[PDB]
């Protein structure tokens, strides 16, 4: 299934040929991959949880302590605060 964004393998079929030109096929293996469709899925969700997360105050999104998701780090004068 070929596109410039990605080309994926979607069908594998084993076939053989007879000496008279006839063709023997087996049921193919069909594959499917997820799609990226922002044109249909663009769901806006308000977020109350990021209270006061201000781009122009001392705030950043960082993972601390090895965690996979970033938390909210605030760097105060004299202390750091963090929401994991």
């Amino acid at each position: 299934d070929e596109s410039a964004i990605a080309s994926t393998l979607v069908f594998v079929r084993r076939v053989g040929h007879e000496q008279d030109g006839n063709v023997v096929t087996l049921p193919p293996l069909e594959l499917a991959y997820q799609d990226f469709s922002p044109r249909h899925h663009a769901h806006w969700q308000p977020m109350d949880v990021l209270a006061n997360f201000n781009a122009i105050q001392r705030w950043q999104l960082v993972d601390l302590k090895g965690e996979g998701l970033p938390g909210l780090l605030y760097q105060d004068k004299g202390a750091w605060w963090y929401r994991s």
């Binding site: 209270a51 006061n52 201000n54 122009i56 105050q57 605030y74 105060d76 004068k77 004299g78 202390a79 605060w81």
Partner: protein, 97 residues
């Protein structure tokens, strides 16, 4: 002198008064007596690590509830933003005041 309360003015009945005593902060204790006995405050700044944004203001007044030979108006400081918030729009320790 270490408490929270609502005020008793005629227009301060809705104001929260957060009060602390210097005597109980144990500031003197941090350094040896031999360094000097006169230990006096030069400047106080207020920090409120609140969910207070860059376009949000806080109204708060810090004042000294006691007798001191302060210059008139030096008895109080107003807070507006809470980030190392001093009593001046510009803080200058060398302006002669």
């Amino acid at each position: 002198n270490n408490n929270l309360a609502f005020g008793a003015g005629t227009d301060t009945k809705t104001s929260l008064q957060a009060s602390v005593s210097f005597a109980d902060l144990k500031i003197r204790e941090d350094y040896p007596a031999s360094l000097g006995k006169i230990r006096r405050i030069k400047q106080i700044s207020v920090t409120l690590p609140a969910l207070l944004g860059p376009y949000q203001d806080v109204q708060a007044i810090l004042s000294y509830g006691d007798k001191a030979g302060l210059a008139n108006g030096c008895e109080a400081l107003a807070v507006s933003h809470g980030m190392n918030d001093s009593g001046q729009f510009q803080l200058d320790f060398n302006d002669g005041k």
